[PDB]
Amino acid sequence: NLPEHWTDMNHQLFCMVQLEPGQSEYNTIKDKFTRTCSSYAIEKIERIQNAFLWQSYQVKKRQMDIKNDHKNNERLLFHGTDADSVPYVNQHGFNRSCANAVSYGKGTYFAVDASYSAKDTYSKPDSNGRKHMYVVRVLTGVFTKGRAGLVTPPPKNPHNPTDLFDSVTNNTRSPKLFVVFFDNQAYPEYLITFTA
Amino acid sequence: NLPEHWTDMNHQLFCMVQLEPGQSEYNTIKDKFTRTCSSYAIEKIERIQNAFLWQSYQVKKRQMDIKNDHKNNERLLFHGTDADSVPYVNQHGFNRSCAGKNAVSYGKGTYFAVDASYSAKDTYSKPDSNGRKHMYVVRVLTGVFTKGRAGLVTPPPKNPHNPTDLFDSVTNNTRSPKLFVVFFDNQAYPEYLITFTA
Ligand SMILES: COc1ccc(OC)c2c1sc1nncn12
């Protein structure tokens, strides 16, 4: 059940597809980034077509939509990383056992604003000054305020300890960071290669 | 597609089902256990019916069967744990971020034993206040494996010049495996909980 906007993969299960400048998909992803990163230079945008990562993610989404009894569990977020992590993320997605600060818990971190992910500490410039940021589908679901040392989100009710929040944030009224603690709660959808 | 021999869960997503001694389902688990744990005695064997854990595990199995082009990817292994961990594992499965440092570490992941005897040690299946010890019987996607190393947070690559093409699991010994370590969520399904005593 692979998304309609994907391009044919000749019966392959993994392809990085460079987007054409000026077309709608490219323009939509460009604007999300330039909203807060209009001072940077975009070299290219790639659609991540990972069928295995996509089905594992869609299964979790269907599970969360049922458990939460609504379908507002998904957000579009940013993740800056180093050149050496890119092949891993394209192929295997986000892994909390890899991850800088972890002051809201030991999970994978996603930014509301591209400009947060554009910091050199996250989108580390390679030899050439090239920086890498993903546009990520993440199942934030029902979230609470994080804190240092969490290995999973907290329970909603301390009297049902196993019924958990889906994600954690820096601030529930006005979130700028989300962290998720489970594989396949995030799908890396686009890779933006850019420079200062 | 939940399996057809499961109890009807009446639209519910989770159920522990107590097995009856003399059923093949109970007896096979008891033989697997007593093969190395003759000195212990089983209080009960519960079938774990977790719809969500089953779905995610089954999509990972189908993915690994496609990728490895063979279907010898799944082993039935043991996992001893403490009583405080049992409600979390029943609902959420095995979380490498919660895993103990093993006495012989072949990587930072969730450990599964070939022999019940290994999982039966008090270090893993810690007796609760009532002398009850807890051991899961677990479907594990061991897939293609290699000898692990203490430093691993992911399985190593099959080929150093292709760092993203990973072994599926690691073992203590590839010729005679007694334990397996997995590094991903939904790579292990807790199928039975054995409650036992001395
Ligand atoms: C405190 O926030 C983070 C901690 C760690 C992060 O990745 C190592 C991270 C953020 S925000 C962000 N955007 N891309 C990556 N990350």
mmCIF file with all atom_site columns, N, CA and C in Angstrom, chain A residues 81-123:
data_model
loop_
_atom_site.group_PDB
_atom_site.id
_atom_site.type_symbol
_atom_site.label_atom_id
_atom_site.label_alt_id
_atom_site.label_comp_id
_atom_site.label_asym_id
_atom_site.label_entity_id
_atom_site.label_seq_id
_atom_site.pdbx_PDB_ins_code
_atom_site.Cartn_x
_atom_site.Cartn_y
_atom_site.Cartn_z
_atom_site.occupancy
_atom_site.B_iso_or_equiv
_atom_site.pdbx_formal_charge
_atom_site.auth_seq_id
_atom_site.auth_comp_id
_atom_site.auth_asym_id
_atom_site.auth_atom_id
_atom_site.pdbx_PDB_model_num
ATOM 1   N N  . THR A 1 81  ? 21.226 15.722 11.191 1.00 0.00 ? 81  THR A N  1
ATOM 2   C CA . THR A 1 81  ? 22.210 14.681 11.574 1.00 0.00 ? 81  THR A CA 1
ATOM 3   C C  . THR A 1 81  ? 23.476 14.861 10.733 1.00 0.00 ? 81  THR A C  1
ATOM 4   N N  . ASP A 1 82  ? 24.521 14.091 11.049 1.00 0.00 ? 82  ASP A N  1
ATOM 5   C CA . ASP A 1 82  ? 25.826 14.106 10.338 1.00 0.00 ? 82  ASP A CA 1
ATOM 6   C C  . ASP A 1 82  ? 25.726 13.264 9.061  1.00 0.00 ? 82  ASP A C  1
ATOM 7   N N  . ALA A 1 83  ? 26.605 13.549 8.099  1.00 0.00 ? 83  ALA A N  1
ATOM 8   C CA . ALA A 1 83  ? 26.754 12.817 6.824  1.00 0.00 ? 83  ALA A CA 1
ATOM 9   C C  . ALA A 1 83  ? 26.845 11.311 7.083  1.00 0.00 ? 83  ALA A C  1
ATOM 10  N N  . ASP A 1 84  ? 27.567 10.905 8.121  1.00 0.00 ? 84  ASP A N  1
ATOM 11  C CA . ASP A 1 84  ? 27.883 9.470  8.364  1.00 0.00 ? 84  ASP A CA 1
ATOM 12  C C  . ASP A 1 84  ? 26.642 8.711  8.842  1.00 0.00 ? 84  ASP A C  1
ATOM 13  N N  . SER A 1 85  ? 25.631 9.394  9.382  1.00 0.00 ? 85  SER A N  1
ATOM 14  C CA . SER A 1 85  ? 24.358 8.775  9.856  1.00 0.00 ? 85  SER A CA 1
ATOM 15  C C  . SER A 1 85  ? 23.313 8.678  8.733  1.00 0.00 ? 85  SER A C  1
ATOM 16  N N  . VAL A 1 86  ? 23.491 9.381  7.610  1.00 0.00 ? 86  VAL A N  1
ATOM 17  C CA . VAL A 1 86  ? 22.437 9.528  6.557  1.00 0.00 ? 86  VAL A CA 1
ATOM 18  C C  . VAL A 1 86  ? 22.097 8.169  5.948  1.00 0.00 ? 86  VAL A C  1
ATOM 19  N N  . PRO A 1 87  ? 23.088 7.360  5.500  1.00 0.00 ? 87  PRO A N  1
ATOM 20  C CA . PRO A 1 87  ? 22.793 6.071  4.880  1.00 0.00 ? 87  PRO A CA 1
ATOM 21  C C  . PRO A 1 87  ? 21.992 5.208  5.865  1.00 0.00 ? 87  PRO A C  1
ATOM 22  N N  . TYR A 1 88  ? 22.398 5.199  7.130  1.00 0.00 ? 88  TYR A N  1
ATOM 23  C CA . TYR A 1 88  ? 21.708 4.424  8.189  1.00 0.00 ? 88  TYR A CA 1
ATOM 24  C C  . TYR A 1 88  ? 20.247 4.881  8.278  1.00 0.00 ? 88  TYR A C  1
ATOM 25  N N  . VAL A 1 89  ? 20.007 6.189  8.384  1.00 0.00 ? 89  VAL A N  1
ATOM 26  C CA . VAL A 1 89  ? 18.625 6.711  8.552  1.00 0.00 ? 89  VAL A CA 1
ATOM 27  C C  . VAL A 1 89  ? 17.806 6.347  7.313  1.00 0.00 ? 89  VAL A C  1
ATOM 28  N N  . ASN A 1 90  ? 18.349 6.541  6.099  1.00 0.00 ? 90  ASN A N  1
ATOM 29  C CA . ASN A 1 90  ? 17.600 6.241  4.845  1.00 0.00 ? 90  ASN A CA 1
ATOM 30  C C  . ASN A 1 90  ? 17.124 4.786  4.892  1.00 0.00 ? 90  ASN A C  1
ATOM 31  N N  . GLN A 1 91  ? 17.980 3.881  5.383  1.00 0.00 ? 91  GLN A N  1
ATOM 32  C CA . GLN A 1 91  ? 17.772 2.411  5.285  1.00 0.00 ? 91  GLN A CA 1
ATOM 33  C C  . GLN A 1 91  ? 16.997 1.899  6.504  1.00 0.00 ? 91  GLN A C  1
ATOM 34  N N  . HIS A 1 92  ? 17.315 2.371  7.711  1.00 0.00 ? 92  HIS A N  1
ATOM 35  C CA . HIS A 1 92  ? 16.807 1.783  8.986  1.00 0.00 ? 92  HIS A CA 1
ATOM 36  C C  . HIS A 1 92  ? 15.983 2.779  9.806  1.00 0.00 ? 92  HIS A C  1
ATOM 37  N N  . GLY A 1 93  ? 15.875 4.041  9.387  1.00 0.00 ? 93  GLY A N  1
ATOM 38  C CA . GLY A 1 93  ? 15.147 5.065  10.158 1.00 0.00 ? 93  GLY A CA 1
ATOM 39  C C  . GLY A 1 93  ? 15.904 5.484  11.409 1.00 0.00 ? 93  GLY A C  1
ATOM 40  N N  . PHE A 1 94  ? 15.180 5.977  12.412 1.00 0.00 ? 94  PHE A N  1
ATOM 41  C CA . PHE A 1 94  ? 15.742 6.598  13.636 1.00 0.00 ? 94  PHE A CA 1
ATOM 42  C C  . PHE A 1 94  ? 15.892 5.529  14.731 1.00 0.00 ? 94  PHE A C  1
ATOM 43  N N  . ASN A 1 95  ? 17.005 5.604  15.457 1.00 0.00 ? 95  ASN A N  1
ATOM 44  C CA . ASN A 1 95  ? 17.407 4.595  16.459 1.00 0.00 ? 95  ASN A CA 1
ATOM 45  C C  . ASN A 1 95  ? 17.912 5.340  17.695 1.00 0.00 ? 95  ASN A C  1
ATOM 46  N N  . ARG A 1 96  ? 17.152 5.261  18.790 1.00 0.00 ? 96  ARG A N  1
ATOM 47  C CA . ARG A 1 96  ? 17.445 5.940  20.084 1.00 0.00 ? 96  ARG A CA 1
ATOM 48  C C  . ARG A 1 96  ? 18.777 5.459  20.677 1.00 0.00 ? 96  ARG A C  1
ATOM 49  N N  . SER A 1 97  ? 19.251 4.252  20.323 1.00 0.00 ? 97  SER A N  1
ATOM 50  C CA . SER A 1 97  ? 20.519 3.624  20.796 1.00 0.00 ? 97  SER A CA 1
ATOM 51  C C  . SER A 1 97  ? 21.760 4.265  20.153 1.00 0.00 ? 97  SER A C  1
ATOM 52  N N  . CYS A 1 98  ? 21.575 5.110  19.135 1.00 0.00 ? 98  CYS A N  1
ATOM 53  C CA . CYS A 1 98  ? 22.674 5.841  18.449 1.00 0.00 ? 98  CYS A CA 1
ATOM 54  C C  . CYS A 1 98  ? 22.910 7.175  19.176 1.00 0.00 ? 98  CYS A C  1
ATOM 55  N N  . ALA A 1 99  ? 21.900 8.059  19.221 1.00 0.00 ? 99  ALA A N  1
ATOM 56  C CA . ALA A 1 99  ? 22.003 9.500  19.583 1.00 0.00 ? 99  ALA A CA 1
ATOM 57  C C  . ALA A 1 99  ? 23.171 9.743  20.549 1.00 0.00 ? 99  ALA A C  1
ATOM 58  N N  . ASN A 1 100 ? 24.905 14.528 21.839 1.00 0.00 ? 100 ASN A N  1
ATOM 59  C CA . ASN A 1 100 ? 24.122 15.770 22.091 1.00 0.00 ? 100 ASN A CA 1
ATOM 60  C C  . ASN A 1 100 ? 23.292 15.612 23.367 1.00 0.00 ? 100 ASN A C  1
ATOM 61  N N  . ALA A 1 101 ? 22.657 16.699 23.816 1.00 0.00 ? 101 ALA A N  1
ATOM 62  C CA . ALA A 1 101 ? 21.733 16.727 24.971 1.00 0.00 ? 101 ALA A CA 1
ATOM 63  C C  . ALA A 1 101 ? 20.639 15.667 24.772 1.00 0.00 ? 101 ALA A C  1
ATOM 64  N N  . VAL A 1 102 ? 20.162 15.084 25.880 1.00 0.00 ? 102 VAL A N  1
ATOM 65  C CA . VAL A 1 102 ? 18.997 14.144 25.951 1.00 0.00 ? 102 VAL A CA 1
ATOM 66  C C  . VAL A 1 102 ? 18.196 14.477 27.225 1.00 0.00 ? 102 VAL A C  1
ATOM 67  N N  . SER A 1 103 ? 18.005 15.775 27.437 1.00 0.00 ? 103 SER A N  1
ATOM 68  C CA . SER A 1 103 ? 17.486 16.368 28.687 1.00 0.00 ? 103 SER A CA 1
ATOM 69  C C  . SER A 1 103 ? 15.976 16.142 28.810 1.00 0.00 ? 103 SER A C  1
ATOM 70  N N  . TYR A 1 104 ? 15.293 15.706 27.746 1.00 0.00 ? 104 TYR A N  1
ATOM 71  C CA . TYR A 1 104 ? 13.857 15.335 27.814 1.00 0.00 ? 104 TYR A CA 1
ATOM 72  C C  . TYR A 1 104 ? 13.677 13.825 27.641 1.00 0.00 ? 104 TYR A C  1
ATOM 73  N N  . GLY A 1 105 ? 14.756 13.037 27.686 1.00 0.00 ? 105 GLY A N  1
ATOM 74  C CA . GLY A 1 105 ? 14.658 11.565 27.660 1.00 0.00 ? 105 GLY A CA 1
ATOM 75  C C  . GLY A 1 105 ? 15.577 10.947 26.633 1.00 0.00 ? 105 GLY A C  1
ATOM 76  N N  . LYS A 1 106 ? 15.822 9.641  26.749 1.00 0.00 ? 106 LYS A N  1
ATOM 77  C CA . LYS A 1 106 ? 16.726 8.890  25.845 1.00 0.00 ? 106 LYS A CA 1
ATOM 78  C C  . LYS A 1 106 ? 15.906 8.351  24.676 1.00 0.00 ? 106 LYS A C  1
ATOM 79  N N  . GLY A 1 107 ? 15.518 9.251  23.785 1.00 0.00 ? 107 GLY A N  1
ATOM 80  C CA . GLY A 1 107 ? 14.796 8.931  22.545 1.00 0.00 ? 107 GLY A CA 1
ATOM 81  C C  . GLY A 1 107 ? 15.404 9.658  21.368 1.00 0.00 ? 107 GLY A C  1
ATOM 82  N N  . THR A 1 108 ? 14.728 9.622  20.229 1.00 0.00 ? 108 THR A N  1
ATOM 83  C CA . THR A 1 108 ? 15.116 10.402 19.038 1.00 0.00 ? 108 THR A CA 1
ATOM 84  C C  . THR A 1 108 ? 14.395 11.746 19.109 1.00 0.00 ? 108 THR A C  1
ATOM 85  N N  . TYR A 1 109 ? 15.110 12.816 18.773 1.00 0.00 ? 109 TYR A N  1
ATOM 86  C CA . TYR A 1 109 ? 14.653 14.221 18.929 1.00 0.00 ? 109 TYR A CA 1
ATOM 87  C C  . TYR A 1 109 ? 14.233 14.727 17.556 1.00 0.00 ? 109 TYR A C  1
ATOM 88  N N  . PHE A 1 110 ? 13.117 15.454 17.509 1.00 0.00 ? 110 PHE A N  1
ATOM 89  C CA . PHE A 1 110 ? 12.598 16.099 16.285 1.00 0.00 ? 110 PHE A CA 1
ATOM 90  C C  . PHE A 1 110 ? 12.205 17.542 16.615 1.00 0.00 ? 110 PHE A C  1
ATOM 91  N N  . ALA A 1 111 ? 12.515 18.470 15.713 1.00 0.00 ? 111 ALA A N  1
ATOM 92  C CA . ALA A 1 111 ? 12.284 19.918 15.908 1.00 0.00 ? 111 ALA A CA 1
ATOM 93  C C  . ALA A 1 111 ? 11.042 20.334 15.138 1.00 0.00 ? 111 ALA A C  1
ATOM 94  N N  . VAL A 1 112 ? 10.228 21.205 15.723 1.00 0.00 ? 112 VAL A N  1
ATOM 95  C CA . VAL A 1 112 ? 9.111  21.882 15.000 1.00 0.00 ? 112 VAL A CA 1
ATOM 96  C C  . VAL A 1 112 ? 9.685  22.772 13.882 1.00 0.00 ? 112 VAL A C  1
ATOM 97  N N  . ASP A 1 113 ? 10.778 23.482 14.149 1.00 0.00 ? 113 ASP A N  1
ATOM 98  C CA . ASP A 1 113 ? 11.355 24.494 13.226 1.00 0.00 ? 113 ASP A CA 1
ATOM 99  C C  . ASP A 1 113 ? 12.640 23.920 12.632 1.00 0.00 ? 113 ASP A C  1
ATOM 100 N N  . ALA A 1 114 ? 12.818 24.038 11.312 1.00 0.00 ? 114 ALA A N  1
ATOM 101 C CA . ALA A 1 114 ? 14.027 23.586 10.585 1.00 0.00 ? 114 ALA A CA 1
ATOM 102 C C  . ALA A 1 114 ? 15.271 24.291 11.144 1.00 0.00 ? 114 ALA A C  1
ATOM 103 N N  . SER A 1 115 ? 15.118 25.541 11.585 1.00 0.00 ? 115 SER A N  1
ATOM 104 C CA . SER A 1 115 ? 16.222 26.397 12.082 1.00 0.00 ? 115 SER A CA 1
ATOM 105 C C  . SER A 1 115 ? 16.836 25.782 13.348 1.00 0.00 ? 115 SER A C  1
ATOM 106 N N  . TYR A 1 116 ? 16.048 25.090 14.168 1.00 0.00 ? 116 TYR A N  1
ATOM 107 C CA . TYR A 1 116 ? 16.573 24.337 15.336 1.00 0.00 ? 116 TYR A CA 1
ATOM 108 C C  . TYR A 1 116 ? 17.442 23.177 14.829 1.00 0.00 ? 116 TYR A C  1
ATOM 109 N N  . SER A 1 117 ? 16.957 22.442 13.823 1.00 0.00 ? 117 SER A N  1
ATOM 110 C CA . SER A 1 117 ? 17.648 21.255 13.246 1.00 0.00 ? 117 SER A CA 1
ATOM 111 C C  . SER A 1 117 ? 18.865 21.704 12.429 1.00 0.00 ? 117 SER A C  1
ATOM 112 N N  . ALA A 1 118 ? 18.882 22.961 11.971 1.00 0.00 ? 118 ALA A N  1
ATOM 113 C CA . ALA A 1 118 ? 19.964 23.568 11.149 1.00 0.00 ? 118 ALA A CA 1
ATOM 114 C C  . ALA A 1 118 ? 21.217 23.896 11.984 1.00 0.00 ? 118 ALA A C  1
ATOM 115 N N  . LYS A 1 119 ? 21.138 23.893 13.312 1.00 0.00 ? 119 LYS A N  1
ATOM 116 C CA . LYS A 1 119 ? 22.331 24.029 14.185 1.00 0.00 ? 119 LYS A CA 1
ATOM 117 C C  . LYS A 1 119 ? 23.371 22.952 13.817 1.00 0.00 ? 119 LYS A C  1
ATOM 118 N N  . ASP A 1 120 ? 24.640 23.373 13.746 1.00 0.00 ? 120 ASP A N  1
ATOM 119 C CA . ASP A 1 120 ? 25.838 22.565 13.392 1.00 0.00 ? 120 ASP A CA 1
ATOM 120 C C  . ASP A 1 120 ? 25.987 21.372 14.341 1.00 0.00 ? 120 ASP A C  1
ATOM 121 N N  . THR A 1 121 ? 25.573 21.518 15.595 1.00 0.00 ? 121 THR A N  1
ATOM 122 C CA . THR A 1 121 ? 25.612 20.425 16.595 1.00 0.00 ? 121 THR A CA 1
ATOM 123 C C  . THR A 1 121 ? 24.743 19.243 16.125 1.00 0.00 ? 121 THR A C  1
ATOM 124 N N  . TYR A 1 122 ? 23.645 19.484 15.395 1.00 0.00 ? 122 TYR A N  1
ATOM 125 C CA . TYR A 1 122 ? 22.756 18.425 14.847 1.00 0.00 ? 122 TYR A CA 1
ATOM 126 C C  . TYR A 1 122 ? 23.074 18.201 13.362 1.00 0.00 ? 122 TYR A C  1
ATOM 127 N N  . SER A 1 123 ? 22.857 19.184 12.474 1.00 0.00 ? 123 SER A N  1
ATOM 128 C CA . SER A 1 123 ? 23.167 19.039 11.021 1.00 0.00 ? 123 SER A CA 1
ATOM 129 C C  . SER A 1 123 ? 24.644 19.403 10.781 1.00 0.00 ? 123 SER A C  1
#
